[PDB]
Design an enzyme around this catalytic site. Structure first.
Site, PDB file in Angstrom:
ATOM      1  N   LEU E  65       0.780  -1.229   0.000  1.00  0.00           N
ATOM      2  CA  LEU E  65       0.000   0.000   0.000  1.00  0.00           C
ATOM      3  C   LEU E  65       0.811   1.278   0.000  1.00  0.00           C
ATOM      4  O   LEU E  65       0.226   2.344   0.209  1.00  0.00           O
ATOM      5  CB  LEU E  65      -1.012  -0.022   1.160  1.00  0.00           C
ATOM      6  N   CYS E  66       2.112   1.225  -0.303  1.00  0.00           N
ATOM      7  CA  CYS E  66       2.860   2.469  -0.508  1.00  0.00           C
ATOM      8  C   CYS E  66       2.599   3.029  -1.905  1.00  0.00           C
ATOM      9  O   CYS E  66       2.173   2.313  -2.809  1.00  0.00           O
ATOM     10  CB  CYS E  66       4.373   2.273  -0.348  1.00  0.00           C
ATOM     11  N   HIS E  67       2.851   4.313  -2.104  1.00  0.00           N
ATOM     12  CA  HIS E  67       2.666   4.958  -3.403  1.00  0.00           C
ATOM     13  C   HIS E  67       4.027   5.168  -4.054  1.00  0.00           C
ATOM     14  O   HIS E  67       5.041   5.478  -3.419  1.00  0.00           O
ATOM     15  CB  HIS E  67       1.999   6.322  -3.246  1.00  0.00           C
ATOM     16  N   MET E 103       8.836   5.239   4.963  1.00  0.00           N
ATOM     17  CA  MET E 103       9.040   3.841   4.561  1.00  0.00           C
ATOM     18  C   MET E 103      10.259   3.666   3.664  1.00  0.00           C
ATOM     19  O   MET E 103      10.934   2.625   3.747  1.00  0.00           O
ATOM     20  CB  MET E 103       7.807   3.259   3.888  1.00  0.00           C
ATOM     21  N   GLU E 104      10.544   4.634   2.796  1.00  0.00           N
ATOM     22  CA  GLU E 104      11.717   4.554   1.931  1.00  0.00           C
ATOM     23  C   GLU E 104      12.987   4.558   2.784  1.00  0.00           C
ATOM     24  O   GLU E 104      13.910   3.807   2.483  1.00  0.00           O
ATOM     25  CB  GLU E 104      11.784   5.698   0.917  1.00  0.00           C
ATOM     26  N   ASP E 118      24.303 -10.783   4.659  1.00  0.00           N
ATOM     27  CA  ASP E 118      24.685 -11.650   3.558  1.00  0.00           C
ATOM     28  C   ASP E 118      26.197 -11.769   3.372  1.00  0.00           C
ATOM     29  O   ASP E 118      26.689 -12.850   3.040  1.00  0.00           O
ATOM     30  CB  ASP E 118      24.102 -11.127   2.231  1.00  0.00           C
TER      31      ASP E 118
END
Lengths: 143, 143, 143, 143, 143, 143
Positions: E65-67, E103-104, E118
């Site tokens: 649901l992010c744009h 969020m980014e 990793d």
């Protein structure tokens, strides 16, 4: 009469490999900045290396009629050649399957070269990429 | 001392554009097959055109420090040059924003060239891609 | 009680295949323009074919609970049916593995159909896509 | 004579919107399992909704000549219609820009429909998707 | 009652920014190898930095649901903290728009942290990632 | 001295598996809203589950030196822990190959956690993600 990839079902499994090269030609000051250390963008070689590796893994998504394939190994090596006012890119791709990895090696070399271009853009507007070609693939070809 | 893209916040909006070119050199029979009509893969030019257009839109994902951007126009033109035993690729990208689209035009030309390579691979193992360079960008450069 | 894909570990390797069909219904003038040659967007069939092939390879990314898988062959065929005022899309996917490729064939047919829609949009606002369904899959089903 | 998207530079900014619908037809037991609660895959509607939303945002990557664009709103609604032995999908996309969002709404409806298909596959091999069409777009069309 | 993103149409344009942090805790020898120089994988920090930057640009594709949104600036800084047997990650995202970029920044910090993991995996099997949280966002919050 | 993934050619095929966990800490009201039912975004757990599953399949694209690989099974389980004011995420990945799936399980847990964050953002600005770590991998480790 239009695009249609070939079947790779009956081709047998084998150890495939391919190597390609690419060159980015530029001015002495431009290359000197890569060696010294760098443009405002950051580590030129390190960034081009990662871009090239990621691009090889996405070759099937960039080239319409390529087949997806489990790469077992991808290498991107960069080397400043001040005597020629340019950067040399050499790549290596490998896997166990039917399909060869000529396009994956070529794509990794091309995108590495584009990334070098990107990081140096501001300093020189007429850098040239090329040639871009295979060195070896595995009958087969070698170099 | 490592990768870090620049801020484009304060740069103002403008009409940006850029054009690039690429060449794929091959044997007469190989090019002849593109003109005639084609290899077992299908429509060479049509497939390279679409690949190049899609690649331009994904430049921000292939080049680590590029910025995503709303392309308003992308063109990929292909032209057989039998007199030179090669294919010429010319691209055009345009948009209204701050950031220029030099990398998008270069990336579309490179991937179009890789796709031509892919469709002709089986017939010739030593095709060469290059040069790959800008023609125009918009001060600025022109050709 | 919520999404959870099934395990395909113990399923054995086999030659899987599936075929699907899709239709885009439109006005005579609209289809006529596809045959004649085309809308301002370009080669309708050639572009829909490539879109469908690329989409099949990305089915695992579009359908949440599908599994990634090495497609060995994807075909997208388009045929104008003027007698029915519509375009027929037939697809074929194949591979050697455990998991079948019903969704890959269906997804390639759907995206090909969407691309035809896209290229003809400006000319007709009420084109209809459908039906979209399997023809054959490989017990199993056939047509 | 081949693919070439149109320029959207001079088109002005506006509030664009579009709505589409899609249907998946199936057997009573199949739909009953969606209502009851579900197949071995999990929450059918919830999964189809998310797939459709994600797909709308990737329309520019699936349809070759579409332009990337900042979606401001995407909705995917699902409704069981037992009286018709089928599922109804209705989508809505919106944004402020020049380009309309007809393909984004259509693509979200198509992928939602494919996901319903995927989750019910094992139970019924002849489900049919369609029709898939616009309801409204914003002169313009409405429903 | 199910997923449905909010409308950002009427929100006005502004200068948005956000900063996040992440930590990877490990053994002295493991961190020492990052400082010395490295594991068999290569430049740990340089690779984590690029991964984080690329991930920030793809946040809209990873979070349902992010744009999507035109990032104007992304920074990923890494710092060895031998006194705490861990690596500190700090990120910064910025853009001119309506939607914030919390969020980014969080996603870039998380993926940078995963990449450190990793590159060091083989040497230590119990490294821990966390905490992962916002530092600042722009009323608003600051640190 | 820079990034270079290892060769997995000679490693033999085996049944690989790994499990990871992640936690999102929040206020009682915030968690209560997840249980009750939800924020304005929709079904929190269902959306985080799908995001995590999709992310696991794209791990090779997010982590530069990971190898692509045919996941045979991915599970994401979410559990509200009101006694600790937080959400627990547990993931499971499995496949038949050479390479293990530790990063795929970790990435699915991280992205699930980011999605929970996203859906609850508006209600609480200081939620914390972590720890994020392996539980089991398959010598090997277990929990």
């Amino acid at each position: 009469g239009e695009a249609h990839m070939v079947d790779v079902s009956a081709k047998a499994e084998t150890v495939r490999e391919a190597r390609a090269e690419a060159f980015v030609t530029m001015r002495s000051e431009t290359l000197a900045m890569i060696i010294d250390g760098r443009h405002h963008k950051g580590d030129v070689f390190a960034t081009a290396r990662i871009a090239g590796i990621q691009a090889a893994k996405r070759t099937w998504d960039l080239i319409p009629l390529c087949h997806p394939l489990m790469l077992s190994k991808v290498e991107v090596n960069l080397q400043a050649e001040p005597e020629h006012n340019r950067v040399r890119i050499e790549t290596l791709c490998r896997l166990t399957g039917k399909t060869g990895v000529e396009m994956e090696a070529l794509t990794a070399a091309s995108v590495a070269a584009l990334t070098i271009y990107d990081m140096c853009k501001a300093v020189q507007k007429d850098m040239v990429i090329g040639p871009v070609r295979l060195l070896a693939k595995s009958s087969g070809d070698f170099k």
